[PDB]
Design a protein around this ligand. Sequence first.
Ligand SMILES: Nc1ncnc2c1ncn2[C@@H]1O[C@H](CO)[C@@H](O)[C@H]1O
Ligand SMILES: [Cl-]
Length: 343
Amino acid sequence: ALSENVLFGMGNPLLDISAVVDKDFLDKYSLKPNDQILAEDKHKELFDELVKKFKVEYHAGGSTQNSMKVAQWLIQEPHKAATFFGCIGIDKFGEILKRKAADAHVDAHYYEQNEQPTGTCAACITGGNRSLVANLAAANCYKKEKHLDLERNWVLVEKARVYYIAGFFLTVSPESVLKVARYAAENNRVFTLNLSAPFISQFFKEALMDVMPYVDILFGNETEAATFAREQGFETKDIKEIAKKAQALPKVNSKRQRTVIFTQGRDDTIVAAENDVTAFPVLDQNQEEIIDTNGAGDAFVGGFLSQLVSDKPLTECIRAGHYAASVIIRRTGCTFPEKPDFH
Ligand SMILES: Nc1ncnc2c1ncn2[C@@H]1O[C@H](CO)[C@@H](O)[C@H]1O
Ligand SMILES: [Cl-]
């Protein structure tokens, strides 16, 4: 039986707010029916209006937290197998988010501050369409020295066997990422990281390459891989070759070989390990049943991690990732039914 806090994540928590809205609402906030955006000045009151005017459903969100809740869902027992750290506000949304994280059986410990509201992501649904508006807000305000470094929180890091941090968090607290990564190397534990988005490899390459030697498992997708390769001078556009070259990057913990895992949408998931590159087909090809790809990557990682914590074989970790993604992409955002049916 797994211990509590066996899986640790940290990143940018967001309160997901989903609702069926109307034309007037979309028009007021200048939203096309399938826009996916970061909030601009015109959207700062959107979340308050959304909750006042419409019946909403709330979820614990943000990329890393999504992966934690999916992992927890598939782990099932114990509750609080997955830990999550990040920054929230001292507001009603922050209280709702704490409740949702608890409902998801994740052991969330948030840094709370008063300067910024809790981050939010609105899914504004009309018919089969949905408009996404994300406001990072408090998520950008995480303070290593006021949260991670406190013993009551650091000990939860020390409880983990496996760590996962989205590369998005390199834009907020790269020193937190480095400290966790260093601990993983010092203790021969598995540290995992997502490339997260092309802009991470372009604009945050210093932090990314500072952490890379500590990465036991690098997750990403084909678009991130292409950008990473260009920025690192790999001189190839072939995804398998990119994965092989990333696998062979400098590494401090030589007790564990790096694994590089790049998803390709409906095309094969590519896995580079020490002595080979293997392609894992995506067996779910019913494209017409896909209603929303938002969170597919987060769910893939969560499914993978759910099996990794039990030292299951690579094939099983990939199978669980593909399963989780297949569930999430048939629902608005990174959500799932009460119980998993992964066998
Ligand atoms: N178009 C698609 N068809 C089927 N599965 C998909 C698609 N896009 C994403 N996925 C699933 O989500 C994962 C992450 O993108 C993929 O590896 C796959 O498992
Ligand atoms: Cl994140």
